[PDB]
């Protein structure tokens, strides 16, 4: 069609995925639409898997998947991760994070869900 | 000298619509539609009043000729037997009602023997 909304194509979704994995690494809990958590779970688990090794090549690789926040910078988040979160989940084969279905949103009754993680 | 007839028209339409009832759905809710339904129902009721007497005699002819041909004789035979000798006024409906009267039709069949 002619001039209208630009849409929410897969590039926008994956950008939001990077934003949200950065946010959950910053805090440890994110409440949002369930469907987005379902897609971002795989990428988050892959990033956690790559966070165990702490090798400069792997640091360069994960450099492409963080952002800038106010709580911590990209370097600060990375060093905090590689310092304490990496050995925390070194004993389990996956399933480091859980998505729990919350109540529908007030606005569009979207099925809300919380992604969380703990040892 | 303004003259209003709102109440008169409302009463007239109310008494017109009082006749119409038991129609299908919303049909007994519109004055103009119910008028036509009532008129058509009245005309068809007059037609049925005219033709039910027309068809009831044929119905009794069926219901009596059943018994007659069950005895081995057509309704024509019975009409002829009545016609020539011992002419009766017993109606086709009443002779048909004689079926509902036990031990009577045999009396007619034995009486008409000649």
């Amino acid at each position: 069609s002619y001039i209208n909304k630009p849409g929410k194509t897969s590039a926008w979704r994956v950008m939001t995925v990077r934003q949200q994995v950065s946010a959950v690494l910053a805090y440890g809990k994110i409440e949002t639409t369930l469907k987005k958590a379902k897609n971002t779970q795989k990428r988050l688990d892959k990033l956690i898997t790559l966070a165990k090794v702490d090798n400069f090549n792997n640091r360069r690789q994960v450099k492409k998947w963080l952002l800038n926040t106010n709580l911590f910078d990209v370097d600060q988040l990375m060093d905090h991760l590689f310092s304490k979160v990496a050995p925390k989940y070194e004993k389990t084969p996956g399933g480091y994070s859980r998505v729990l279905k919350l109540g529908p949103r007030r606005g569009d009754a979207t099925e809300m869900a919380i992604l969380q993680l703990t040892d | 000298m303004r003259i209003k007839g709102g109440k008169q028209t409302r009463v007239r339409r109310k008494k017109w619509l009082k006749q119409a009832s038991g129609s299908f759905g919303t049909r007994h809710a519109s004055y103009k539609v119910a008028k036509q339904t009532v008129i058509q129902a009245a005309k068809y009721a007059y037609r049925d009043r005219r033709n039910k007497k027309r068809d009831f005699r044929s119905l009794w002819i069926l219901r009596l000729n059943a018994a007659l041909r069950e005895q081995g004789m057509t309704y024509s035979v019975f009409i002829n037997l009545l016609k020539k000798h011992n002419i009766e006024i017993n109606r086709k409906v009443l002779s048909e009602l004689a079926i509902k009267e036990p031990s009577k039709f045999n009396l007619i069949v034995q009486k008409v023997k000649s």
């Binding site: 279905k101 919350l102 919380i114 969380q116 | 919303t26």
Partner: protein, 56 residues
């Protein structure tokens, strides 16, 4: 294309008969007195009976 004649109240109600909804789901939460529907969190700060969040 367009509608030619108006429908009837009974006919439109029969059409709307499929607009009716079915019953929802309802499960039981023991520690927090509440009937929360199945595969959902509990407002008392838990999911099912496992405590995971704040009591809200």
């Amino acid at each position: 294309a367009v509608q030619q004649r108006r429908s009837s109240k009974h006919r439109r109600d029969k059409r709307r008969s499929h607009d009716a909804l079915t019953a929802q789901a309802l499960s039981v939460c023991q520690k927090c007195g509440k009937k929360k529907l199945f595969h959902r969190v509990c407002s008392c700060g838990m999911y099912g009976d496992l405590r995971v969040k704040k009591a809200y």
